[PDB]
Amino acid sequence: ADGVGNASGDWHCDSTWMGDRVVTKSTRTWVLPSYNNHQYREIKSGSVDGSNANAYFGYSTPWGYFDFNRFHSHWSPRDWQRLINNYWGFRPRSLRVKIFNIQVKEVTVQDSTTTIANNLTSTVQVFTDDDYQLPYVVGNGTEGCLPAFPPQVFTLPQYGYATLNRDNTENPTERSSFFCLEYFPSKMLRTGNNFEFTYNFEEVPFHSSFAPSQNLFKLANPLVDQYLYRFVSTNNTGGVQFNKNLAGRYANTYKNWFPGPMGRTQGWNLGSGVNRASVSAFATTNRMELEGASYQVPPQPNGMTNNLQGSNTYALENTMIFNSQPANPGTTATYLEGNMLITSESETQPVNRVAYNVGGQMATNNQSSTTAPATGTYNLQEIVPGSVWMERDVYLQGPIWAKIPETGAHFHPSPAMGGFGLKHPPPMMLIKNTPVPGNITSFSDVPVSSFITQYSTGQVTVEMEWELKKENSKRWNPEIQYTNNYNDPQFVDFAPDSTGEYRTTRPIGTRYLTRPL
Amino acid sequence: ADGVGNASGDWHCDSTWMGDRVVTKSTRTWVLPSYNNHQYREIKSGSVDGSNANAYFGYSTPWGYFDFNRFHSHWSPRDWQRLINNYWGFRPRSLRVKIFNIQVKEVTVQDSTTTIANNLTSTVQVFTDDDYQLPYVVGNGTEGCLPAFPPQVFTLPQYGYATLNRDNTENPTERSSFFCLEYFPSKMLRTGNNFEFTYNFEEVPFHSSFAPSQNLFKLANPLVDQYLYRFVSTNNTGGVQFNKNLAGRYANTYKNWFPGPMGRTQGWNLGSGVNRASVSAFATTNRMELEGASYQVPPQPNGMTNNLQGSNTYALENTMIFNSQPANPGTTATYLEGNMLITSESETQPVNRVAYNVGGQMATNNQSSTTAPATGTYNLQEIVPGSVWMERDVYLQGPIWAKIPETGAHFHPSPAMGGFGLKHPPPMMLIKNTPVPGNITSFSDVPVSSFITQYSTGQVTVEMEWELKKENSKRWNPEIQYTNNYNDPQFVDFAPDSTGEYRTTRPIGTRYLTRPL
Amino acid sequence: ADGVGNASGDWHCDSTWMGDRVVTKSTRTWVLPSYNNHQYREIKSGSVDGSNANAYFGYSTPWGYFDFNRFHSHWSPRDWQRLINNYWGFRPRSLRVKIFNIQVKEVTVQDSTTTIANNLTSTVQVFTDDDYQLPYVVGNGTEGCLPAFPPQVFTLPQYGYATLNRDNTENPTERSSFFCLEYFPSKMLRTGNNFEFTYNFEEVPFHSSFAPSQNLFKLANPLVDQYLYRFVSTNNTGGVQFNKNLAGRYANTYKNWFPGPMGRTQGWNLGSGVNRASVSAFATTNRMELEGASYQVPPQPNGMTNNLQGSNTYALENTMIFNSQPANPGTTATYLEGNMLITSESETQPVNRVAYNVGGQMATNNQSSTTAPATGTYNLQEIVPGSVWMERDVYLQGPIWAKIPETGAHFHPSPAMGGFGLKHPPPMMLIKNTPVPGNITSFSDVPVSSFITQYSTGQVTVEMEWELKKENSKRWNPEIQYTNNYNDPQFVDFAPDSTGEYRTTRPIGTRYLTRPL
């Protein structure tokens, strides 16, 4: 055990469905560049694109990190289908990760030959941050996760963070903090060594994957009248007149429950919708301010629906928008509807309010004999006693969890992009190549800047356990399922191309089952 | 036991007050029509009264149901008085129901004789829905409950529900679901058989029946000044000037706590108030939208008061409005103030904001040497950190509980109409007459459409246990009680008329006791 | 227990999914006419419609019978979907039936009043035939089964059978046998009595519900050549020349396995296909002869596919054709494509041969220097060593089982219409009303022909246990599911109409999952 000619792990990719629970095992091959040539660099930006919200001050590190936080890392398209068609809900239970079969490669360039050899004595460093003392960059929707497709090899992303900057500039504050990652204890691994970590998720609610089977305002019996009466009109000398609420008249009935909060965001017509020409669209987006700068919040808060059933109007600032294929870093190219995976929340429309319409109206004045009653519409409304809504749906291409910010207070900690809000998420796993100095023939007080250039590769297996919520329903007629349906397919979706490129043409969400309110 | 000549239950109507707890027993006689002639009919509506919110798609069933959900079903007017005068709070604990003394009657019409006989071999079917797999129609404020007055006989209401319709029309969606009620296991009862069910309420907060004994903003000591200072003015070269907050000046004092949320709804003058002539009042009501339709929400959310103490101005869309007597189904008649039982929340005015006034004002600009400070009022405000309000009061004529809709998320699940929000309420009890075919002399593949016409009757006893919260108070002077007080009574209220009609002339709420904030 | 005022059973309709197994419980209400006025009548026919195959000799009996043999009797449309989307196979395990809540009704007609009363002393007779000594009429695809929809009431069909007739006429043979059903012991039931029976299915293979994921002739690796060589041509002085079999050339490769048997039946174009005008189609159907008469065999034997994928050509004599709604007995009306539920076997096309094409070709001569090689096609081929095929698919509207005829010998006892061939099927349950004589004031030697006219009704519960075969598959991409998908629905399918009529618009088969050969 533990030698250069002995493998330190095996390939595990499987999914075991047992009763309620399911365990998903996933193995990938990674490669780790040596970033910043073993340096910590201070990174910063001023206002770019004419927005001082793009200014920041921070640090980039030599370290890379493992990111497990998208669903397609863990789940197959066929196992995701088996989940969403058969179950009302799921939540994560446990996690364990293993890093094995480490091999370090030294690369040397003489007159552009660039030969590569392996250094058997070189080391890699790995630590997990269990106390959450570092900036947690994982849940923020950024690339670098394990691939969706198991044979694909991936580079680990470089670790970095932004601290406080002052006055919306690139300059630091006195509260700007520097975190050194070598001031943690870490484990040093040669070829025969491996690393293992285990984690238990805290108790969270099930993600509810079902759609409401009736309307929030239609909950009353259509056959029977209400014993309740409504103010209707007023007569020639105004006294107040009342009518009884009748049967299936749902405009007029009394309500116990009210929809979730809403802001109003601009709707845009996809497909054959006409829209408007030559809009720059940045000035008219919804925004919030912090510290004197104005930020776009491209996901909105929960409690709205971006699309209304089979309409082509979308809010686009209430939407999660994906690309059908991965892109190069820093691409400024413009894309169109056909390139994009544009999700729809319309299965929540019974309980949620559409984002591109007003939320209602209220009285704007006091009536008199002289003045008539008046109303006006409101474009935004917030949490109210007796509100019910549905959370953002989760997709096979989307994030699993987020970390709740550490502050005095918060309300209903559900992430806007989706998934499970976690006070103590799965910890970050950080990894770097240990530096090997070059030829140094003399003593100097200044640190060693000349290093052998190296990279390392290996495998990482992740094993998650999921608790499932059975579907128990008395619905007689058949339901909507996620099916594989294509008219005149020229390729099969979720399979490699003739080149070897893996194709995913559409988003897959969780809510196909239907349940009564 | 269990025969045609042996009674399967006894009449229990009692209330036993023991220490904290009280058990209320209630027995009634019911009659069950055979609805839809043993058919399931698809019911639907388009926009009626010029509102597409009145459109629906649904189903009506042969089944009837038992509805226990109004307070006067369980409580006497004298036991309700004993409760509200002596106690700070109450909540339900357990429930048990029994259905006994079943008798089925066959009715036959030859040349308009319409004779009635009893069918000793006929059956009735009863099931309780313990898993909440059906649409729950009970808590929605619709008629058909056990009578307030024990000798009265009542028909069971027909069970029905609305599912999804599309595009605000009468047409179904793909997610429109059909629920068959014969796909449940049920218990079949002949004459000697009876049915029994027991239920335990989940832990809920006490309904707080008391009124606040002081003002939310007046909580400070009037004798002593605050050590806190306020911005007062600015001088000829504007520097900021401050004064000390003095003693009993409550406009200027610092506050820890803030009132509950509010929308603004139109106030209308009852009694001698002048109002305004010939208002249609539908266009100017407060509304919300779902799915592209606009609904009236005739109860508003909690945290407001409809009436302000002894004023005659009422919001009428913040009010629960009752009739002094039951009405025929589908009555379009117009009613006036004298016919109506119009409740007042004014006992909550210290902590709650009046619905027909603005909620406050805030700064609308940035001052400068050139521009002066400006404000504007707001007509709506929502939940805020450090808010305190009181929930809708419960009445002897009103609902006991509601079911919290099954969705990902909700906030403060208190029903707008009143009572206790319950994730798992008392289950629905559904009952139908089993069909008896007529004379069929041949075989056919089509189902049997010819049936003996029948109805059944019986008794139902309901027994609830209530936990009480004792009144512990150091108030020296006497309090306000609910008393029986009428000037020149021509009849006694809450007693039968000379015809036998039971009269209830006024609403009775729970908050007569007073308690300091 | 066991009295006129005590119910002898309860309503059970449920489905319990536990691991592999599932138990489906089903309760219905039946009505039993008194058939033939308590007589055994000899029934017979000569050649009708110009076919002596329509001639028969037989007997009709006073008895009715219970028929459990269609899938929709046991299964819901939502439980059928849950089955076919998630599982590779199923077979029945046990069965138990209960007949309870019997009530007999006497009907009397004076001057067309036709009053109905119940006779509490009357009896009904029930026996089960465990030894299979009667003609077994159940598995033959005839109407009278428990309804698909639980609230529907159904008449029991009259029991009858055909025996030997001679020379294709209506006259009996010497081997024509008469079976009296009173010569069995049976159980006599009054109002308080009930009947119960239990049965265990014999070991049968799972119905395989999956589709083949590749082609029978394409099983070879497309990347590698065969070490086997083929006769290709012959040169100017004919010697034999050979080529190697290359890679993905599947016309030329060697085969281990061969398709199932086929006959050739005429294809007809549904939908927009042009077809041919004014065909009487009876003369050109496929037939077999027995005893000098010629019969249509509207299902063919197994091993063919009626439709070829997305073509509109159907064999129509290889198809199971259903009506969307039940029909009156003896209807001669003509129907069109839109009224019909026309099943497609096309999911079996990889392994099965299309019915409307030739099956292949073989050598018709011996070559010489003078004569060239010749072939000809064949329209029919039978079982061959090394044949593989798939059995007829089962539908929610189709039969569950059939009885294997009792004879010396049989081959591969799979029913042509579908389901499970059973040597000992679930026994027949026969039921009649016991006769009550009218007023007889004298003695006579001739039997009593005057009877009180009566009918009976009651409930019947059936409980089946099913063994399931889990789906274990490494397919990466999503599969085809049965989904509820309709463009512009005016009603929901598998739900009652506005009249109460239950609508089923399409057939639902079992093979949506895919599995490699």
Q: Cβ contact (<8 Å) for A231 and B184?
A: no
Give the C-alpha separation, A19 to A467, whole Å: 10
Identify which of A18, C115, A331 has the alpha carbon closest to the alpha carbon of residue B438: C115
Q: Side chain identity at A276, as an amino acid letter?
A: R
Q: Which one-letter DSSP state was computed for residue B401?
A: E
Please report the number of interchain residue pairs, chain A to chain B, with beta-carbon separation below 8 angstroms. Answer: 400
Which residues of chain A does B171 touch, with a Cβ-Cβ cutoff of 8 Å?
none
Residue B67 CB contacts under 8 Å (≥ 6 apart), including other chains = B138, B144, B145, B146, B157
The beta-carbon neighbor of B446 closest among C156, C326, C457 is C326
All partners of chain C with 3 or more CB pairs under 8 angstroms: A, B
Q: Which one-letter DSSP state was computed for residue B79?
A: H
Q: Which helix (H) or strand (E) holds B22?
A: strand B21-32
Can you name the residues that pair with C243 across neighbouring β-strands?
Answer: C230
Give the C-alpha separation, A53 to A36, whole Å: 26
Residue A374 CB contacts under 8 Å (≥ 6 apart), including other chains = A363, A364, A365, B284
**What count of other Cβ atoms lies within 10 Å of the Cβ of residue B102?**
25
Characterize A154-177 residue by residue with b for buried, 16 or more Cβ atoms within 10 angstroms of its Cβ, and e for exposed: bebbbbbbbbebeebebebeeebe
Q: Please list every residue in chain C followed by a chain break, i.e. its C lies more than 2.5 Å from the next written N.
A: none
Residue C301 CB contacts under 8 Å (≥ 6 apart), including other chains = C261, C263, C416
Identify which of B406, B394, B405, B401 has the alpha carbon closest to the alpha carbon of residue B425: B401
Beta strands in B67-215 (DSSP E): 87-108, 115-118, 124-129, 153-155, 158-163, 187-189, 195-200, 207-208, 211-212
All partners of chain B with 3 or more CB pairs under 8 angstroms: A, C
Q: Cβ contact (<8 Å) for A474 and B294?
A: no
Q: Are A472 and B131 in contact (CB under 8 A)?
A: yes
CA distance to partner chain A, nearest, from residue C469 (Å): 14
Angle between helices C77-86 and A77-86 in degrees, nearest 10: 160
**B46's tokens:** 């388009």
**What count of other Cβ atoms lies within 10 Å of the Cβ of residue A205?**
13
CA distance to partner chain C, nearest, from residue A460 (Å): 21
Q: Which residue has the tokens 């001031």?
A: A183
The beta-carbon neighbor of B171 closest among C329, C490, C494 is C490
Q: What are phi and psi of C90, to 5 degrees?
A: -155, 155
Identify which of A429, A402, A421 has the alpha carbon closest to the alpha carbon of residue A139: A402
Residue C321, judged by CB atoms within 10 A of its CB (0-12, 13-18, 19+), counts as middle
**B42's tokens:** 């698809």
Residue A10 CB contacts under 8 Å (≥ 6 apart), including other chains = none
Q: Cβ contact (<8 Å) for C114 and B439?
A: yes
The total number of structural domains that make up chain B:
1
Q: Does residue C85 sit in helix, strand or coil?
A: helix
CA distances from B409 to A82, A182, A206, A259, A404 (A): 25, 42, 11, 11, 17
Identify which of B174, B426, C23 has the alpha carbon closest to the alpha carbon of residue A475: B174
Q: Side chain identity at B86, as an amino acid letter?
A: N
Q: What are phi and psi of A456, to 5 degrees?
A: -130, 160
Helix locations, A427-472, DSSP H? none
CA distance to partner chain C, nearest, from residue A76 (Å): 6
Q: Which one-letter DSSP state was computed for residue A77?
A: H
From its phi and psi, is residue B95 left (phi > 0), alpha (psi between -120 and 50) or beta? Answer: beta
Q: Cβ contact (<8 Å) for A478 and C482?
A: yes
**What count of other Cβ atoms lies within 10 Å of the Cβ of residue A496?**
14
In C, minimum Cα distance to B433 occurs at C151
Give the C-alpha separation, B116 to B455, whole Å: 10
Give the C-alpha separation, A77 to A83, whole Å: 10
Task: Kindly give the pairing relationship between strand C87-108 and strand C195-200.
Answer: antiparallel
Resolution in A: 3.1
Q: What are phi and psi of B321, to 5 degrees?
A: -115, 125
Give me the long-range contacts of B11-14 (CB less than 8 A, separation at least 24).
Answer: B11/B459, B11/B461, B12/B461, B12/B463, B13/B150
Q: Which one-letter DSSP state was computed for residue B186?
A: B
Which residues of chain B does C1 touch, with a Cβ-Cβ cutoff of 8 Å?
2
Identify which of C230, C367, C382 has the alpha carbon closest to the alpha carbon of residue C301: C382
**C52's tokens:** 């002596």
The half-sphere exposure of B516 on its side-chain side, counting CA atoms within 13 A, is 8
Q: Does residue A347 sit in helix, strand or coil?
A: helix
**What count of other Cβ atoms lies within 10 Å of the Cβ of residue B444?**
17
Give the C-alpha separation, B208 to B390, whole Å: 8
Q: Cβ contact (<8 Å) for C329 and B44?
A: no
**A512's tokens:** 């196909």
Give the C-alpha separation, B253 to B255, whole Å: 6
The beta-carbon neighbor of C14 closest among B185, B191, B437 is B185
Which residues of chain C does A76 touch, with a Cβ-Cβ cutoff of 8 Å?
476
Q: Cβ contact (<8 Å) for A82 and C86?
A: yes
Identify which of B161, B184, B180, B189 has the alpha carbon closest to the alpha carbon of residue B39: B180
Q: Does residue C242 sit in helix, strand or coil?
A: strand
Q: Which one-letter DSSP state was computed for residue B466?
A: E
Q: Are A302 and A414 in contact (CB under 8 A)?
A: yes
Which residues of chain C does B435 touch, with a Cβ-Cβ cutoff of 8 Å?
29, 153
Give the C-alpha separation, B259 to A375, whole Å: 24
**What count of other Cβ atoms lies within 10 Å of the Cβ of residue A512?**
23
CA distance to partner chain C, nearest, from residue A489 (Å): 13
Q: Which helix (H) or strand (E) holds C432?
A: strand C428-433
Cα–chain center distance at B221: 39
Q: What angle do CA C44, C48, C52 make, to 5 degrees?
A: 80
Q: Which one-letter DSSP state was computed for residue B172?
A: B
Cα–chain center distance at C7: 35
Residue A104, judged by CB atoms within 10 A of its CB (0-12, 13-18, 19+), counts as buried
CA distances from C325 to B36, B445, C271, C496, C502 (A): 21, 10, 21, 12, 8
Task: Kindly give the pairing relationship between strand B293-296 and strand B287-290.
Answer: antiparallel
Give the C-alpha separation, A172 to A263, whole Å: 34
Q: Cβ contact (<8 Å) for A373 and B301?
A: no
Helix locations, C391-498, DSSP H? none
Which residues of chain A does B266 touch, with a Cβ-Cβ cutoff of 8 Å?
363, 366-367, 373
Q: Cβ contact (<8 Å) for C152 and B447?
A: yes
The beta-carbon neighbor of A241 closest among B43, B261, B336 is B336
**C469's tokens:** 């075969």
The beta-carbon neighbor of A362 closest among B142, B179, B263 is B263
Which residues of chain B does C118 touch, with a Cβ-Cβ cutoff of 8 Å?
119-121
Residue B105, judged by CB atoms within 10 A of its CB (0-12, 13-18, 19+), counts as middle
Q: Which helix (H) or strand (E) holds C287?
A: strand C287-290
Residue B478 CB contacts under 8 Å (≥ 6 apart), including other chains = none
Q: What are phi and psi of A298, to 5 degrees?
A: -65, -30
Cα–chain center distance at C213: 27
The secondary structure of C474-516, three-state, reads CCCCCCCCCCCCCCCCCCCCCEECCCCCEECCCCCECCCCEEC
Q: Are A433 and A158 in contact (CB under 8 A)?
A: no
Give the C-alpha separation, A359 to A377, whole Å: 7
Give the C-alpha separation, B141 to B143, whole Å: 7
Q: Does residue B139 sit in helix, strand or coil?
A: helix
**B98's tokens:** 């029994």
Task: Kindly give the pairing relationship between strand B287-290 and strand A360-363.
Answer: antiparallel
Q: Does residue A74 sit in helix, strand or coil?
A: helix
Can you name the residues that pair with B288 across neighbouring β-strands?
Answer: A360, B295
Give the C-alpha separation, B354 to B370, whole Å: 37
**What count of other Cβ atoms lies within 10 Å of the Cβ of residue A215?**
22
Q: Which one-letter DSSP state was computed for residue B138?
A: G
What is the longest distance spanned by two Cα atoms in chain A? 107
A436 lies in which domain range? 2-517
Characterize A105-143 residue by residue with b for buried, 16 or more Cβ atoms within 10 angstroms of its Cβ, and e for exposed: beeeeeeeeeeeeebeebbbbbbbbeeeebbbbbbebee
Give the C-alpha separation, A272 to A123, whole Å: 58
Q: What is the CATH number of the domain that holds C202?
A: 2.170.30.10
Q: Does residue A182 sit in helix, strand or coil?
A: helix
Characterize A47-61 residue by residue with b for buried, 16 or more Cβ atoms within 10 angstroms of its Cβ, and e for exposed: eeeeebbebbbbbbb
